[PDB]
Design a protein around this ligand. Sequence first.
Ligand SMILES: NC(=O)C1=CN([C@@H]2O[C@H](COP(=O)(O)OP(=O)(O)OC[C@H]3O[C@@H](n4cnc5c(N)ncnc54)[C@H](OP(=O)(O)O)[C@@H]3O)[C@@H](O)[C@H]2O)C=CC1
Ligand SMILES: NC(=O)C1=CN([C@@H]2O[C@H](COP(=O)(O)OP(=O)(O)OC[C@H]3O[C@@H](n4cnc5c(N)ncnc54)[C@H](OP(=O)(O)O)[C@@H]3O)[C@@H](O)[C@H]2O)C=CC1
Ligand SMILES: COC(=O)c1ccc(-c2nc(N)nc(N)c2C#CC2CC2)cc1
Ligand SMILES: COC(=O)c1ccc(-c2nc(N)nc(N)c2C#CC2CC2)cc1
Ligand SMILES: [Co+2]
Ligand SMILES: [Co+2]
Lengths: 159, 159
Amino acid sequence: MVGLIWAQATSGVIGRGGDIPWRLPEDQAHFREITMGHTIVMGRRTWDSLPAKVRPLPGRRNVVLSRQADFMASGAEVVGSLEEALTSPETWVIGGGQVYALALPYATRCEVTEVDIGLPREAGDALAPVLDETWRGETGEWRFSRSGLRYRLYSYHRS
Amino acid sequence: MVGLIWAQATSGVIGRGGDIPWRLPEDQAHFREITMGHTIVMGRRTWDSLPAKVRPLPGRRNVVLSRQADFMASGAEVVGSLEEALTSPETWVIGGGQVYALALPYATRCEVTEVDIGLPREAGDALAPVLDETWRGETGEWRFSRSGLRYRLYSYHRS
Ligand SMILES: NC(=O)C1=CN([C@@H]2O[C@H](COP(=O)(O)OP(=O)(O)OC[C@H]3O[C@@H](n4cnc5c(N)ncnc54)[C@H](OP(=O)(O)O)[C@@H]3O)[C@@H](O)[C@H]2O)C=CC1
Ligand SMILES: NC(=O)C1=CN([C@@H]2O[C@H](COP(=O)(O)OP(=O)(O)OC[C@H]3O[C@@H](n4cnc5c(N)ncnc54)[C@H](OP(=O)(O)O)[C@@H]3O)[C@@H](O)[C@H]2O)C=CC1
Ligand SMILES: COC(=O)c1ccc(-c2nc(N)nc(N)c2C#CC2CC2)cc1
Ligand SMILES: COC(=O)c1ccc(-c2nc(N)nc(N)c2C#CC2CC2)cc1
Ligand SMILES: [Co+2]
Ligand SMILES: [Co+2]
């Protein structure tokens, strides 16, 4: 099983300047729970976005996508194509914008956190993929974070 | 991944007299979306609750738990232990109360339809399993069924 997990503002922005322009702790917990134990796949830039003291993510099979055949990620597997990374019974593609688009045709589930911030899209922003109607998606309600930001969860599936 | 999917009253009742004191088409669609294509594991009583006109459920691997080594379920596999059914990548335990409690230690997901029906428990009822605190759950909106009862969906998850 290949799943996609991401947090987005309403506008679809997921990343900017190698960072995530917000802090929503509830989403981090949600992310940790859904990924823990399983294989996680990320783009090389997203691997670069993590301080060395926080990578690899504990308890998961860290895999990095890069087209550099020689690229080292200390503590993760480096593959040159998704299917080399997808190897895994349950695999979760954890970002970023480039990888999500590459993987979506192989995914059956998308776990979406939507953050109620008016964050407009700027050139070079990383974006969430847009999910059509073939994704049956079950809408949560607008929860209130201890960070101060309104948020809600979506669970998408297509058979 | 071992999943549990069930519909319950607010009281925890899931079956009574070998069947279900409600019918929500919205919940049937929800069920088919989550189970379609995968292995479904059901107790023999639940298999008996399906007309032969409706079983096996199309497009899924139908598995029945029974202690009768000769029990015959036309269109399904009959297994005498639960671990036998777990060979497929995604397995959904679809009832009833006995099999739910047998499967809970293998489960990381629970897809719950909660029906707003004042249905007090009585002896003989089948019951939804009890979820300890290791289960975190995303509560849904009270939706409106065309049957006239409100409902809402839960997804419980644990690593
Ligand atoms: N909000 C969220 O939920 C998340 C947000 N983010 C944010 O996303 C942003 C980065 O995302 P993005 O900018 O899209 O960069 P990515 O994280 O998408 O990684 C892009 C890299 O992936 C590799 N790659 C892409 N396609 C392929 C392929 N077909 N085969 C092999 N390797 C490939 C390349 O590595 P190389 O250059 O080595 O070839 C490319 O540089 C950051 O700001 C980060 O914080 C990240 C994760 C989650
Ligand atoms: N609302 C919902 O979402 C659902 C409700 N239901 C309802 O639940 C009720 C049935 O649930 P329940 O009454 O608990 O009966 P079950 O559906 O749990 O089937 C029980 C049967 O499973 C087999 N079984 C149980 N434990 C084992 C074991 N350890 N090893 C091997 N075989 C085993 C036995 O088959 P044998 O006797 O042949 O050994 C037993 O009779 C019905 O009312 C049904 O409609 C059903 C599904 C979903
Ligand atoms: C301090 O902020 C955090 O620690 C934090 C922020 C966001 C997420 C998150 N959340 C959802 N829903 N999907 C995702 N793919 C990610 C991610 C990620 C990556 C690290 C590579 C997790 C943790
Ligand atoms: C005409 O439709 C129906 O009779 C009907 C549709 C759906 C369910 C249902 N619903 C949720 N949420 N979980 C479940 N495990 C099940 C189940 C079951 C099975 C007996 C096979 C029940 C009955
Ligand atoms: Co599915
Ligand atoms: Co999991």
